[model samples]
Target: GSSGSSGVEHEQQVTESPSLASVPTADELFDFHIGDRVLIGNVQPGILRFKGETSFAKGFWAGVELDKPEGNNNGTYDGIAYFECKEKHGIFAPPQKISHIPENFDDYVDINEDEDSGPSSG
Candidate 1:
């Protein structure tokens, strides 16, 4: 009697998506040098002054001199000197947060439209 079969099994599990290639990793620090103009995470603009590991972090760091007095350090951390900058103008952050973006300040206005008329009159 081939009536019906009560033995049935189904095994299926969800799997995570594959890793993306565009993903970023901290394998190495960004290439930077002293006096390199850069931006700090859309928060401020600064110039690179330090690039290396420090007692504050385990990996590499970027010490920058901000354009204004908006940072918390003056090129020193925990009473340790990393670089030289004005008071409240120095800050230390991971190289990932610092973007090397140099800008051109070469825009000038020509406001003198003086066309000399031929020597004028008798």
Candidate 2:
């Protein structure tokens, strides 16, 4: 009847504004679906693998995969199945525990610079 539970809880958020101490909440980034590129705080890079609320159960939850191979279950966890992925990297956390990559995350990359030399070397 209730949502799945986990051993720990991690709040996923970030500082969107370089000047401010706050940024968009998970709800704002919650507009995600399968294959959405997301960054789950305290976790590694992966797409929105599955949804526990609408896919597995009620009470919103985020099914994200970690870039690591030794994080959590392999997606078929706790006797309930969500999806499949690398062993231990697949995880499900509250929607508030996920964040979409901010737009300015890669703004510092200089695409115009030569690839051989450093961006500042030229």
Candidate 3:
């Protein structure tokens, strides 16, 4: 029983910020969820398709499907697919980039059950 051939080493290095700083390092910073009608940078409006940690970059990212064809990618980035949309209709942005959720936002309504919520005048 002889197992002694390992050396542990510790190194500490300071990293500098980038020239175009203000990048975020937080995770899950938004209370928003998927399929939300969100406005990006207070200019562009899109539907929230995906929201979570992606394999493309650091920190949390939100995948959105723009209302119009005015974005960078079609739900894809760097050969990696995040969501699905038309050309120039998909975009991935940090929570900070997401300005806010639009007012009176509504989702798809459920199918009519037709039990006790319909008129009986016909």
TM-score of 3: 0.58
Candidate 1 vs candidate 2, TM-score winner? 1
Q: Global lDDT of each model?
A: 0.73, 0.65, 0.73
Which has the better TM-score: candidate 2, or candidate 3?
A: 3
Model 2, 6-121: lDDT tens per residue? Answer: 78757746645474557644343346777765677734555677865544565676778765675587777667777667778787777777778666454343222223545674
For candidate 3, write residues 1-118 as lDDT tens digits.
2256458644533475463447656666468877667788878878788888777687678887776789889877888887777889888888787756567544643431324654
The residue-level lDDT of candidate 2 at 111 comes to 25
| Model 3, residue 83: C-alpha shift (Å) | 1.1
Where is the poorest 10-residue window by lDDT in model 2? Answer: 106-115
Q: How well does candidate 3 score on lDDT at residue 3?
A: 57
Q: How much is the lDDT of residue 15 in candidate 2?
A: 45
**Model 2 spans with C-alpha error above 4 angstroms:** 1-30, 54-58, 102-122
